[PDB]
Amino acid sequence: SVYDAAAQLTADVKKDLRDSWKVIGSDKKGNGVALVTTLFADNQETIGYFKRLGDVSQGMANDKLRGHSITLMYALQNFIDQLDNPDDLVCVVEKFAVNHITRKISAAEFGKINGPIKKVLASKNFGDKYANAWAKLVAVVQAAL
Amino acid sequence: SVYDAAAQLTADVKKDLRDSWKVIGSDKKGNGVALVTTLFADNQETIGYFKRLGDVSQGMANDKLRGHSITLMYALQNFIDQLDNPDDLVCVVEKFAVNHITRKISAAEFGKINGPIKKVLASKNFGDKYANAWAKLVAVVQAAL
Ligand code: HEM
Numbered sequence: 486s487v488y489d490a491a492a493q494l495t496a497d498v499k500k501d502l503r504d505s506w507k508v509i510g511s512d513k514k515g516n517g518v519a520l521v522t523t524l525f526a527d528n529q530e531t532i533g534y535f536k537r538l539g540d541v542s543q544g545m546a547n548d549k550l551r552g553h554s555i556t557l558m559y560a561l562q563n564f565i566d567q568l569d570n571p572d573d574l575v576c577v578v579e580k581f582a583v584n585h586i587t588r589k590i591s592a593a594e595f596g597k598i599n600g601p602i603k604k605v606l607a608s609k610n611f612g613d614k615y616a617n618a619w620a621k622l623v624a625v626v627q628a629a630l
Numbered sequence: 631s632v633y634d635a636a637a638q639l640t641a642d643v644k645k646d647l648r649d650s651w652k653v654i655g656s657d658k659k660g661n662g663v664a665l666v667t668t669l670f671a672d673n674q675e676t677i678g679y680f681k682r683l684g685d686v687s688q689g690m691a692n693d694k695l696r697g698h699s700i701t702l703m704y705a706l707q708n709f710i711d712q713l714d715n716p717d718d719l720v721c722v723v724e725k726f727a728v729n730h731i732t733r734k735i736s737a738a739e740f741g742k743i744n745g746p747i748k749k750v751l752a753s754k755n756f757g758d759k760y761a762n763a764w765a766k767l768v769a770v771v772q773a774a775l
Pocket residue numbers: 531534535536537538553556557560561581584585588590594595596597598729
């Protein structure tokens with residue numbers, strides 16, 4: 486269950502998530518756009534899903550893409566803030582899961598975000614240990630898809 | 631015009647928004663559920679739009695309602711964090727406006743949130759001065775609907 490995935494996050498994993506978020510979450514506009522644009526760069530097959538955003542090749546200049554990217558970072562802020570109460574983490578994760586289920590995004594496709602997260606983390610010198618911790622958080626959402 | 635509306639957020643208004651948010655934003659789960667449930671209590675005619683959340687009279691005990699309410703508070707957090715840059719405030723406001731336009735929510739009905747905000751603020755000893763500041767922020771979203 487999603488609760489199981491959530492309840493499994495250990496103290497060490499939560500520590501790594503919080504420490505790295507202190508940095509990557511400090512510039513939501515910059516890192517959010519980097520995250521989304523990297524997804525498009527490395528997984529071009531996903532571009533079609535974001536037609537509402539218009540020309541995503543415009544990057545930062547695209548106001549719809551910028552608004553979407555900043556907001557995505559607040560979903561992550563939400564997750565990080567709920568780490569110590571699995572009950573609250575689960576209800577917010579299911580909320581965002583619905584946003585993706587309606588767009589026909591499978592658990593496997595949602596996992597495509599792990600590559601971009603790993604790259605953004607690396608840009609701030611957060612290595613594999615941190616990428617693995619984030620993959621565990623993403624897996625909580627995957628349990629809901 | 632959303633831009634002209636954003637221009638109404640003067641130094642004094644921004645300060646009142648930040649000062650009051652420091653308190654109401656400190657308990658997103660508690661104050662978010664209070665805000666949403668007050669909207670339902672005071673404007674029963676809006677409950678029909680929230681069919682996805684199930685039985686909203688259950689308040690905090692309703693997982694979907696709790697997830698929705700917490701997330702709503704992060705949208706407000708987002709707005710507050712963008713107060714320094716109007717172009718960014720506008721792009722995030724338009725993102726959330728679309729979420730409501732697709733739900734068929736007009737500027738007038740969106741404005742029904744002012745009553746609940748005034749009440750939640752009053753419960754934390756923040757009077758009309760603050761309620762009016764928040765009404766100006768809500769007005770930016772209304773301009774985009
Ligand atoms: C860290 C992981 C991710 C987070 C936290 C996240 C968060 C969000 C948020 C907050 C929204 C806006 C929901 C709405 O207002 O309707 C959104 C929309 C969307 N997401 Fe994600 N997402 C993630 C990964 C992905 C991935 C990997 C895909 C695709 C393979 C995806 C596809 C979509 C699509 C198609 C939309 C709709 C965009 C639009 O038309 O506005 N998401 N996402």
